[PDB]
Paper text:
We resolved two different conformations of the thumb loop of the 3’ dyskerin subunit. In State 2, the thumb loop is rotated away from hTR, towards the 3’ GAR1 subunit (State 2, d). This is accompanied by an outward movement of the hTR P7 duplex and a rotameric switch of F98 of the 3’ GAR1 hydrophobic surface. hTR moves out of the 3’ dyskerin active site. Interestingly, the thumb loop in our open state adopts a significantly less open conformation compared to the archaeal counterpart. To understand this difference, we compared our open state structure with the reported yeast Cbf5-Nop10-Gar1 ternary complex. In both structures, we observe that the eukaryote-specific helix 1 of GAR1 blocks the thumb loop from adopting an archaeal-like open conformation. The two states resemble the substrate loading and the product-release state of archaeal H/ACA RNP. Our structures illuminate features that are specific to the eukaryotic H/ACA pseudouridylation system, namely: the interactions between the eukaryotic specific helix 1 of GAR1 and the thumb loop; and the subtle differences between the open and closed conformation of the thumb loop compared to archaeal H/ACA RNPs.
Human telomerase is comprised of two distinct functional lobes tethered by telomerase RNA (hTR): a catalytic core, responsible for DNA extension; and a Hinge and ACA (H/ACA) box RNP, responsible for telomerase biogenesis. The telomerase H/ACA RNP contains two H/ACA heterotetramers of dyskerin, NOP10, NHP2, and GAR1, each assembled on the 5’ and 3’ RNA hairpins of hTR. Furthermore, the telomerase H/ACA RNP also contains a Cajal body localization factor, TCAB1. The catalytic pseudouridine synthase subunit of H/ACA RNPs (Cbf5 in archaea and yeast, and dyskerin in human) converts a substrate uridine to a pseudouridine (Ψ).
Author numbering:
A (entry chain F), H (entry chain J): 1 to 64
B (entry chain K): 146 to 204, 209 to 443, 449 to 489, 510 to 522
C (entry chain C): 23 to 186, 192 to 421
D (entry chain D): 66 to 159
E (entry chain E), I (entry chain I): 23 to 152
F (entry chain G): 43 to 395
G (entry chain H): 65 to 161
RNA sequence: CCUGCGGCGGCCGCAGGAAGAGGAACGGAGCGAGUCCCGGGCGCGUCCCUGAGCUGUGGGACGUGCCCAGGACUCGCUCACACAUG
């Protein structure tokens, strides 16, 4: 893959072909992580994502 | 060889350096292995240590004794004993029982030093209760242990949760209090229980049926010994001066009384000859004293292993050695180091 | 000062006092189809609520999933069909669909409709979309100016062949070149699409028009109709983790973060609120007639597509408006809309047609024989009824 | 052998073994796929393979015959097709 | 550069090896690769972690999206296998031998370098809890 | 001085009253209520509850019996059974407050205990990870084996934490957030099994019952006795008023429905909660949700189950908003003023006429 | 008498005080009765089920060993087997639907 | 009994086994004093609790 | 050390013995224990104040929660017994020949130590009321 | 005639309807009883105990007076039969 992005101040993706944003910090891979239907490792991800306060429930809720 | 105190026992080296690792440590007693291979010592740091007979005895200033294992318990050890039938000839028999505060009865293997088995005892609320005394039956098949108004019998072949319960105080009648020590008769089905409620009881091994209940020390009873005579046995207590002698023939009253200084709430051990003739006791004054039980037991000797309480003694089953353990609790005032030692008690 | 404040709390008297002023609500932050619910035009308030349904967000977790959809970020290996099959197996639901087929390598927005929400899949599939993708030019060119010119030239209603075929026409609303690398000749474009537009074909045409030739290197869908990657987007890992967390901890929360109710998709549409007695009739396939209406929005126009909702904010059906907003306000009778797609399951709301005054009068007159057995007039019909009653089936 | 021909369109820059051409067909009618393309001399250069661009000014490309090369063709050169293959634009529009 | 590398770290990338320990780990990886005792990539690493193999698992704190290696550090804790994060993907890749980046490797003991391996093992196990 | 306050500072159920939705602003105030803090002392204690720090020796039943003998009242109930040796937070509801006890017994708990391990482990991290394994919905059996066979059941632990480990004594302090009915003794036993060394519960304290925690408003049995003594001897209410809180403090978390003054006694007699009576209603009222119905002075009339949502209440003009779950207030606290409204008067007239 | 057939019940984890802890592996996450016998692959009784503890999908159990059995005998990931009629479905512990 | 505690700057409880908190103070037992319903010293307790300004009434009112 | 113990005090801790008076009280307690003339623990001290036995009552100033012993000063003031607070319960246990702590000791007068006892009484009553 | 579901962008089959959209007291409350899944603890008071035994902020002996599993589900008695007064 070659597609990379850095967020705006406005909070939305700006795609770029570079490995670094114009302020020098690393751009993220645009594509999601690989998945297979047979992950039994959901427990491990939930544990860690709780410990560092990054589980999706812990973020403030979206506007509905 | 033989045991004979014609003179003061001779010093062979002990262990002093270990116990200093904890400030205000002291030894809670020592016991020879029933084959004489090694000696087990409890301590105020709750670590069961074990020393071999230094081969320097067979092979001058000895080396200081160092233990081969250190079986760490998590809380205060109430009692500990060698397996009744231990031998060096048979590896699997060589294990140590131990009882600790709010822990089960741990079994430790005496060669490797790992935890080997656990016996767990529970009250009516399914809560764990600790054993204040331990004893292996003279046939090795059972592990008797003492509790408050209760003796529970575990089977050594099935470690776990299963025990017979033998109530010693029944509808407020019988032997009350914490049963502090258990002993068996060399000949007879008797076993004898001492209690912190200052009392003795004799029971039937197979039943648990009371045979007698006997007069009091003026303090809670802490140790027992049967003579190689099935006929006669001895007992001591905490904060008593007197060490009492009993007999199964003409029972009901202690035949003789013997004097020793106990002024602490301590188990001051005493021990007999493997042939039964001599009786040796420690004291809080430090003075170890000896009687000849071959009439009233006749005083033989007093000597001072150290200038502190001698709380544990033990006599080697084959060989002339005496072992002593030392120390007591140090009391403060608001604003003298303990040790195991060995002695030769044979002829020159 | 909380010492002072608390002594005041115990010391002195509190009451909610009478006033003569008008009570005006603020519904601007009620959820989904209940937003600005007081600003609707009101026909009547006299009806009986039935307490049988739910507010869409606060549905029980069973019904929440069955009415729900996921704004998924598609992983790069599987096909969209295989993805929705995975999602069906994870959630243990029986039926699933999506908003459009991303060919396997492509990632991005895939609106995965679950169970009863799959009734919306056709409307989601027809919706306009946006893409980000890489074009790999086979030969060098004067620069990004030329690629931008090619993208401008292709911004229109276009001829397209599918990849291997027949000719088709799809429109591309707006195109920009994000940036271009002259070293590898990889250029990244953003295009807004009519649904069904082929981006591989567009890349080939960019190559042809430039003359260098080119391909699509990889592609990402950033928007699928109303949902964007900015907008509540969830990964496959989030779906699986959510279902696992719900199973093991009994914690509904993370599923309720991943799955949304279908009423979120309809939010753009004009609303028309029905009496609870009307709801199950519309679910069974009835016409949407004026006596049922309680509320209606501004700017409802003839043949416009509107969402027909209950008083709890649920969606009953998608519908085609026959009366303008002004006509709805003024008229005595008629059909305000007709069904296009019934969303709500039958017998969620109970069966209460034929119990009202006019319909009971007609129902009685059939038994009296004053109308034919088929309900249409006879010589026995009174002149008053035969004049006044307008049968919508003619 | 061709019965009769009419205009397709006008030359534009070449592509990978291919010619890309600007269609100027009368009233913007559209060719068939695989439609043979002829010169002013009525000799066949190849056949149409791609149709692209926005509807009114749309382009196309030709898979050239093995006898011809893209280097031969020239600016403002016009190309031809039999009118019986041309399709009316209103088949696609609505 | 290390201060700049701390900007790129992902939210779960702790405990993070200190700069001295980071250089030490690079050196240890470079020794271990020569004896073919490293594993690399999440697929291989997790396969052999399931198989029962032990070592020090070194993780790149740069990794985004996090979901790929997230299951690894709890999977370590289930097996009592030590793990540590280091501040870049590219240097971890380079030390492993990969010219392209890498997000996880597993350095295993061998007799040649085990002095440095024991340095790494004790220093990593003596890191603070987050 | 009340006018100085924000509505956010108004006490109990009147807190943030103005951020409720407003149906109407007109009613005729009757005189015969008070703010729950300003109840006359006998009434205050009959409606009140105590957030108690339970002592170590007695059972919770004994504790509540002692409370109802100290305060001279005839009914008491508690938040959840604490085993005799267990200390901590026990909500004790007095007289009319006993109507809320089933709500309290369902509520979530927090505990702080100590587990004694029967053999050594590598350290605190093992115990923490073993606590993580036992989070979620768990199989448990009640803590006695002496009764031959006991049924297995599922209990949920929401969070767990390890606060200390003492390797010398093999003691670890754990904090557990869990649902009511969870057996912590059994948790310690299973934690010991999971480490492999064995275990017991050494000691336990409950630090939260539902909405009440040990942090604030918690008092000792000594406070109850001494407050009753001070009231009896010196006729001073003050120290009782701090020991006992009004039951409205328990209901603060619930969604609110504010009634016209005429509707109150009708509800207390068992009438359903009609929409013409409603003055104000809260965002997020849902169908079949348990809500609290209050008077304009803040007094909880009843626990009601909502038969309308908030938007439905906004749209309609009459009908059942809610049905009674449990009536807190007593009859004729407010006078009978039903049957006097316009439509009901029409119906009365036309039945006679 | 021994049962007719037996189904996979669990893998062997650590011993715990002359008593053995097992991870439970059953195909529908079926849950055993208390004091149900536990067998080897030989349909040979090693003990009985004492404790059940775990997360409802993912749970453990403990075995009280037989009169002559001994915890040292077993090896990690060793399988144990149970009479299928002694199992209960996981649905039975989930609430009234 | 073993549970001790000390206070955090919030005024929250930090539970410990330590007899001293990290700033050097002693820790308090977590458990309240033993109670009897037949206790007769209510007068005495109220008297010196008033005397040293630590009676419950003399504390600031709790915000409700 | 008196300052460190001073930090531990209760709110009711006044009147608090001077450092020298604290030493005097400890040594008097020591002498009285040798004579078997103290009562210690709230249970004994309370019982024998009820029976009316005279003495000096020494209270640990660091006892929490206060409600275990805070009734006692009023029990003394009713009978006009003397009382005083001392900085720690561990020292109060230590002076009584105890390794465990205790929070209250009553020192009864007896012949051998009485000169020091009368000195202690003399100073304790000299103490300012709070 | 309308809707829903299935099968190859229209058709075919099967299933549910034929819908004008009712009801400003419906059918409640409070209290009590019945049917299904006390031997001890605690409190107090004639003497011991800093036990190495929990323990003096409390443990024991001998005396002595307050506490007794929850949840489903049915209906007898009292009071109403309530749309809440611009």
């Amino acid at each position: 893959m070659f597609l990379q992005y850095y967020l705006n101040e406005q909070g939305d993706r700006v795609y770029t072909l570079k490995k670094f944003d114009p302020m020098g910090q690393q751009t993220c891979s645009a594509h999601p992580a690989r998945f297979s239907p047979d992950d039994k490792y959901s427990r491990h991800r939930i544990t860690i994502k709780k410990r560092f306060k990054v589980l999706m429930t812990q973020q403030p809720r979206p506007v509905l | 060889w033989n045991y004979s105190f014609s003179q003061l026992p001779r010093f062979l080296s002990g262990s002093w350096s270990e116990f200093s690792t904890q400030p205000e440590n002291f030894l809670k007693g020592c016991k020879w292995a029933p084959d004489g291979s090694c000696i087990l010592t409890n301590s105020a740091d709750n670590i069961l240590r074990i020393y071999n007979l230094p081969p320097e005895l067979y092979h001058v200033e000895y080396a200081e004794m160092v233990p081969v294992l250190r079986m760490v318990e998590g809380d205060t050890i109430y009692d500990y004993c060698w397996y009744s039938l231990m031998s060096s000839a048979q590896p699997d028999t060589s294990y140590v029982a131990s009882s600790s505060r709010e822990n089960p009865i741990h079994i430790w293997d005496a060669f490797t030093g790992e935890l080997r088995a656990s016996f767990r005892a529970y009250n009516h609320l399914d809560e764990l209760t600790a054993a204040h005394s331990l004893c292996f039956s003279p046939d090795g098949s059972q592990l008797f242990c003492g509790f408050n108004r209760t003796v529970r019998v575990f089977s050594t072949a099935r470690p776990g949760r299963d025990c017979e319960v033998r109530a010693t105080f029944a509808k407020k009648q019988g032997q009350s209090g914490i049963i502090s020590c258990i002993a068996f008769s060399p000949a007879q089905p008797l076993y004898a229980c001492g209690s912190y409620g200052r009392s003795l009881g004799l029971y039937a091994w197979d039943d648990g049926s009371p045979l007698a209940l006997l007069g009091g020390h003026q303090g809670g009873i802490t140790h027992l010994c049967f003579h190689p005579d099935g006929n006669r046995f001895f007992s001591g207590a905490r904060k008593d001066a007197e060490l009492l002698c009993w007999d199964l023939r003409q029972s009901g009253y202690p035949l003789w009384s013997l004097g020793r200084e106990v002024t602490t709430n301590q188990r001051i051990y005493f021990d007999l000859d493997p042939t039964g003739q001599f009786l040796v006791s420690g004291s809080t004054s430090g003075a170890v004293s000896v009687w000849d039980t071959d009439g009233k037991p006749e005083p033989v000797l007093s000597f001072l292993p150290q200038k502190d309480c001698t709380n544990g003694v033990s006599l080697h089953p084959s060989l002339p050695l005496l072992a002593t353990a030392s120390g007591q609790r140090v009391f403060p005032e608001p604003t003298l180091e303990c040790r195991l030692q060995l002695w030769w008690c044979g002829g020159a | 000062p909380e010492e002072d404040v608390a002594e005041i709390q115990h010391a002195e008297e509190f009451l909610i006092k009478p006033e003569s002023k008008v009570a005006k609500l603020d519904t601007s932050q009620w959820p989904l189809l209940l937003k600005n619910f007081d600003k609707l035009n009101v026909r009547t308030t006299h009806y009986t609520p039935l307490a049988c349904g739910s507010n869409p967000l606060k549905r029980e977790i069973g019904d929440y999933i069955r009415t729900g959809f996921i704004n998924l970020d598609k992983p790069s290996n599987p096909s969209s069909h295989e993805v929705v099959a995975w999602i069906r197996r994870i959630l243990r639901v029986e039926k699933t669909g999506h908003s459009g087929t991303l060919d396997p390598k492509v990632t991005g927005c895939l609106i995965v409709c679950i169970e009863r929400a799959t009734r919306l899949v056709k409307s989601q599939q027809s919706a306009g979309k946006e893409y980000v993708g890489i074009v790999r030019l086979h030969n060098a060119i004067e620069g990004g100016t030329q690629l931008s010119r090619a993208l401008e030239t292709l911004t229109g209603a276009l001829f397209q062949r599918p990849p291997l075929r027949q000719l088709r026409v799809r429109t591309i609303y707006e195109s920009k070149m994000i940036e271009y690398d002259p070293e590898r000749r990889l250029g990244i474009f953003w295009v807004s699409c009519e649904a069904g537009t082929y981006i591989r074909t567009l890349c080939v045409h960019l190559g042809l028009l430039l003359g260098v030739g080119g391909q699509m290197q990889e592609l990402r869908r950033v928007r699928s109709g109303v949902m964007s990657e900015k907008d509540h987007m969830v990964t496959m890992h989030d779906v699986l983790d959510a279902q696992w967390l719900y199973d093991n901890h009994k914690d509904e929360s993370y599923l309720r973060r991943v799955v949304y109710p279908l009423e979120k998709l309809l939010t753009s549409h004009k609303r028309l609120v029905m009496k609870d007695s009307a709801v199950n009739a519309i679910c069974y396939g009835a016409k949407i007639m004026l006596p049922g209406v309680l509320r209606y929005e501004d700017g409802i126009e003839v043949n416009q597509e509107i969402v027909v909702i209950t008083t709890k904010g649920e969606a009953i059906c998608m519908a085609i408006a026959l009366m303008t907003t002004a006509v709805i306000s003024t008229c005595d009778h008629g059909i305000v809309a007709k069904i296009k797609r019934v969303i709500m399951e039958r017998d969620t709301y109970p069966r209460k047609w034929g119990l009202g005054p006019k319909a009971s009068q007609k129902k009685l007159m059939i038994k009296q024989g004053l109308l034919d057995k088929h309900g249409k007039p006879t010589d026995s019909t009174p002149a008053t009824w035969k004049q006044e009653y307008v049968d919508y089936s003619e | 052998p061709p019965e009769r021909v009419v205009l397709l369109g006008e030359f534009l820059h070449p592509c990978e073994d291919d010619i890309v051409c600007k269609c100027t067909t009368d009233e913007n009618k559209v060719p068939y796929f695989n439609a043979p393309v002829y010169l002013e001399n009525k000799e066949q250069i190849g056949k149409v393979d791609e149709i692209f661009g926005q509807l009114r000014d749309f382009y196309f490309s030709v898979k050239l015959s093995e006898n011809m090369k893209a280097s031969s063709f020239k600016k403002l050169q016009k190309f031809y097709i039999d009118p019986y293959k041309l399709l009316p634009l209103q088949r696609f529009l609505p | 550069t290390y201060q700049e590398l701390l900007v790129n770290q992902n939210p779960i990338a702790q405990p993070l090896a200190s700069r001295r320990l980071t250089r030490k780990l690079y050196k240890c990886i470079k020794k271990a690769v020569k004896q073919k005792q490293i594993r690399r990539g999440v697929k291989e690493v997790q396969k052999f972690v399931n198989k029962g193999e032990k070592g020090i698992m070194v993780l790149a704190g740069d990794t985004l999206p996090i979901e790929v290696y997230c299951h690894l550090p709890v999977m370590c804790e289930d097996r009592n296998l030590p793990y540590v994060y280091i501040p870049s993907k590219t240097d971890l890749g380079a030390a492993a031998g990969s010219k392209r980046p890498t997000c996880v490797i597993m350095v295993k003991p061998h007799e040649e370098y085990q002095e440095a391996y024991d340095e790494c093992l004790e220093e990593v196990q003596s890191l603070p809890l987050p």
